[PDB]
């Protein structure tokens, strides 16, 4: 009957009479997991496995419960062994896919950007095997595929390792919005002269749209479609995705208007067309979920977009009073102060934002590197000053981490060359300057292009 707090006493009483009852151990561990006692559930499932090593459901439950405390190696080992033992049950396959997806997401969060892509590819391979051979399908597997397909868009330096063949196989093995965004499998890869980022975005949209089964699941389905279209529009910057996102968000709001994330998405979608509707949506989202601090930051950035400095300052003061550990309010305050004309306070706020970010924001890294470069170009410094050299080194490290996610950025490449030429790091400068020279050569007939090319060639001659 799904009241798991009431069965704990009965399972314990049953285990007090026969301590060797495996089924009672499995039930008790399942009750602890359902009640929020993950570690106790892990201990109980370990005991059940010790009593009978051939029990597969105990191993599956233990792996699932181990995934909840951040131990992905042991859980993945257990689940791989279980799936190799009994390969005909879809439950174990879906559990393995979920654990792989969660491991990759955690690795991305912690800064291990190179392992996350490989684990994402492994997850895609397992999903392909499931869908093709096992002939199974449910909403969860498509949700996991959509979640894992975003790491190829966030880590743009590794987008060339996208498994297009496995993806087309998975989609081929398995109408209202198809007229707005025009995303169809039959004509997806037909268009040539587009990067792999566009292909990844289209695959994300298709994965969101394929995840079909009191009208909560339908609303969630439309909300997921809207979020995917919003991400595609932000990355590619094309009008036809904004309209699809608006369509999906409106349909989801019609099906259920009680959720806050739908209003957040609708506010972000129309943030450039009509600021009044966006403000209304952000305010309603705050009213529905008041313990969410992203709505306040969105509203402050919307105020900054229309050049209302005092409104943004007041909202950011409230946000700082509400979420000090976040780094976005400090970045916003630093931007406002830099526009106003202050230099020392802007630098202090940029440094605080960068330190609080802990490698999770590209904007923080870029702004910090630009500020450090702007303060130490014609300041009259000597190589014997330790603090200036350490600042330059930190800026260089931040720019390398930034380039891991967003390469082919002209301003960041120029700043990196300026820092590297001053730290006497000539090989990295050579590589980055070759990349930048290729970019500028591809991008070009005007006048300022020639002048920028001449300046870049002068710096490149200095590097040689």
């Amino acid at each position: 009957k799904q009241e798991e707090s009431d069965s704990i006493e009965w399972f314990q009483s049953a285990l007090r009479v026969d301590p060797n009852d495996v089924e009672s151990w499995v039930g008790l561990g399942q009750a602890y997991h359902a009640c929020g006692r993950i570690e106790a559930s892990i201990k109980v499932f370990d005991k059940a496995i010790q009593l009978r090593p051939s029990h597969t459901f105990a191993q599956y439950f233990k792996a699932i419960s181990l995934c909840d405390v951040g131990e992905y190696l042991e859980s993945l080992d257990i689940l791989e062994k279980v799936c190799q033992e009994a390969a005909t049950e879809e439950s174990f396959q879906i559990g393995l896919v979920e654990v792989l997806m969660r491991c990759s997401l955690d690795l991305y969060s912690q800064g291990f950007l190179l392992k996350s892509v490989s684990i994402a590819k492994d997850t895609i391979e397992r999903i392909k095997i499931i869908i093709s051979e096992l002939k199974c399908e449910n909403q969860q597997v498509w949700i996991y595929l959509s979640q894992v397909l975003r790491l190829f868009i966030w880590i743009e330096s590794k987008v060339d390792t996208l498994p297009v063949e496995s993806l087309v196989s998975i989609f081929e093995n398995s109408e209202e919005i198809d007229s707005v965004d025009n995303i169809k499998i039959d004509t997806l890869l037909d268009s040539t002269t587009d990067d792999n980022v566009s292909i990844a975005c289209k695959f994300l949209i298709l994965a969101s749209k394929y995840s079909v089964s009191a009208g909560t699941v339908r609303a969630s389905y439309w909300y997921n479609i809207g979020i995917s279209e919003l991400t595609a529009f932000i990355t590619l910057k094309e009008p036809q995705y904004r309209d699809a996102a608006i369509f999906a968000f409106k349909k989801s709001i019609q099906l259920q208007s009680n959720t806050s994330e739908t209003w957040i998405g609708l506010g972000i979608a129309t943030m450039d067309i009509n600021f009044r509707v966006s403000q209304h949506c952000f305010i309603k989202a705050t009213a529905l979920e008041p313990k969410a601090t992203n709505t306040w930051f969105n509203l402050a950035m919307l105020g900054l977009k229309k050049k209302d400095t005092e409104f943004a300052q007041q909202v950011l003061n409230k946000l700082q009073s509400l979420a000090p550990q976040d780094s976005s309010p400090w970045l916003g305050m630093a931007l406002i102060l830099e526009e106003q004309g202050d230099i020392i306070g802007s630098s202090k706020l940029f440094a605080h934002s960068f330190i609080l970010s802990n490698g999770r924001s590209k904007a923080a890294q870029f702004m910090y590197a630009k500020n450090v470069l702007e303060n130490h170009i014609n300041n009259g410094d000597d190589e014997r000053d330790i603090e200036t050299v350490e600042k330059l080194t930190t800026a260089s490290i931040a720019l390398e981490q930034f380039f891991k996610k967003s390469p082919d950025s002209q301003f960041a490449l120029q700043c990196a060359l300026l820092t590297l030429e001053r730290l006497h790091h000539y090989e990295n400068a050579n590589e980055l300057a070759n990349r930048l020279i290729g970019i500028l050569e591809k991008k070009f007939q005007d006048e300022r292009e020639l002048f920028n090319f001449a300046i870049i060639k002068g710096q490149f001659a200095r590097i040689h």
Binding site: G111, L114, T394, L423, H425
Partner: protein
Amino acid sequence: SKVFIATANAGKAHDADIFSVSACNSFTVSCSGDGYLKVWDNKLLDNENPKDKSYSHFVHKSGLHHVDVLQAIFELCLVATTSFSGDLLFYRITRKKVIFEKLDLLDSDMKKHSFWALKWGASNSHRLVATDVKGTTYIWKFHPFANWSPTLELQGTVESPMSQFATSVDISERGLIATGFNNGTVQISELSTLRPLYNFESQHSMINNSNSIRSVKFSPQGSLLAIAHDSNSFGCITLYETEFGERIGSLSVPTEFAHSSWVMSLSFNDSGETLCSAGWDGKLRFWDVKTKERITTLNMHCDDIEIEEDILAVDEHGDSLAEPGVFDVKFLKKGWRLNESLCCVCLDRSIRWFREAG
């Protein structure tokens, strides 16, 4: 991993600087510049002076600066050491006195090389790695039997990526070799193939040539690598990820630097969750690997010696040794000496042992 208690101590242990230390289940071995090799029994009793349970052997008039020990189950216990002239010398330890047997394991053409560093790789055949003053790494396989009949078989060499002085070396349990050089460059190569894998440079700047790798260590899991290097009178530690070869971060404290003077040695605990570093400034610092934050700090004084007659407050020139720098540090597994243990050697010619609370 937060409380360490001093257990045993020994002052004026050697007649010169104690440059390295190593340990096994049975004993702890140290080398020094006087040319002697000393063995300290790990299985002691309560209120027993460590100098009572010690055995010394004379090796070379030039002095010694590296040592390593191999113990495996017929029970064999081997010691390999390097002298200041550049020789590679192997000894067999047998027990209740201790017997030193000199082994002649290198051929005639292999005795013309000057070695600096060395490390044992235990079976999980045993392997030995070593570095040359010319920047080369040699790989050996050790066969104890053919009956006792030890032979050393050469497997191959790894040349320098650029040549520079090879200062440090390590070998992991998954089959990787790391070599450090005197310009700040680290090379990682495959054990079964002798083909290099990664090559990353850890320098804050190249304005001055005062960058140099002093220690490289592999995590007990083998998925992490720690590097200690100089930054023009400072000491720095950087963590790398060995499966794909990417920078993770750095360990730092207000004094962007880990130590005030120089970082001499590194060491991981049994689980690979804590790292310890030894500094020329006379401190031991312990770090959390996941959070990259300092946990604790230990201070070294000349007055820590239990026996007051073995306290060396000043050296032969009158310079103070009130806060002496640490040369080397080592973690000891549980049961070697309940919980883990630690050992270190300092500039006051002392060797010290510690215990972890819990």
